[PDB]
Amino acid sequence: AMEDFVRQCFNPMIVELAEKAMKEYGEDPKIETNKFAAICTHLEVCFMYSDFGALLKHRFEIIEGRDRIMAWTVVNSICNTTGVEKPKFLPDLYDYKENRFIEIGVTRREVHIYYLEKANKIEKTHIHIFSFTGEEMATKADYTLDEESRARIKTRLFTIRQEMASRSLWDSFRQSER
Numbered sequence: 001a002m003e004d005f006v007r008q009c010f011n012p013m014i015v016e017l018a019e020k021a022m023k024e025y026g027e028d029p030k031i032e033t034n035k036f037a038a039i040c041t042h043l044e045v046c047f048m049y050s051d052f053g054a055l056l057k058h059r060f061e062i063i064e065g066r067d068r069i070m071a072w073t074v075v076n077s078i079c080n081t082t083g084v085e086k087p088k089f090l091p092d093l094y095d096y097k098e099n100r101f102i103e104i105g106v107t108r109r110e111v112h113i114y115y116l117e118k119a120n121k122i123e124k125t126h127i128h129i130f131s132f133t134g135e136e137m138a139t140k141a142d143y144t145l146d147e148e149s150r151a152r153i154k155t156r157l158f159t160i161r162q163e164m165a166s167r168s169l170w171d172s173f174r175q176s177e178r
Ligand SMILES: O=C(O[C@@H]1Cc2c(O)cc(O)cc2O[C@@H]1c1cc(O)c(O)c(O)c1)c1cc(O)c(O)c(O)c1
Pocket: 021, 022, 023, 025, 027, 035, 038, 039, 042, 043, 064, 091, 092, 104, 105, 106, 107, 177
């Protein structure tokens, strides 16, 4: 059962944020278990990406995984102090070094298409897509992180993928992203 996997594979904080998020949108984590696990994955990658952070003490501000009220407080704080334009939707991070917001995507399809669907849904937000195929794609080929950091994100995705596969959950998870 994909539900049981999610609760074994991901830390309880991540799992809880995934539930809250699904319920906010009216979805039952016990029925839409593939989506449940997708959300956990997007969450964990955002935090991983966050935790990689010479000059600045914390290079990234984390925005995903917060209640919307705090998310916008943090986003408006950053905007009102750095002067950067205010997004129309909440992104996932802010980069203090490059002074821009980042929208992380995670797909189990080919990056190039998911990238495009993301970009259309936003415009000054830097997009960075990962996939379970091991690929990635970022606006203007600027991957923000070093290669050490990205490889760790990619390992984690592949680690999730093998643990799914071993329990035959993978192929469903792969097909459900429609
Ligand atoms: O975080 C994911 O969902 C968030 C919660 C959510 C939901 O509950 C229902 C719904 O209609 C939309 C929805 O948008 C949220 C979301 C936030 C993101 O930052 C994001 O990149 C995204 O694809 C989406 C997510 C990410 C994914 O990458 C993904 O494949 C997935 O199935 C889900």
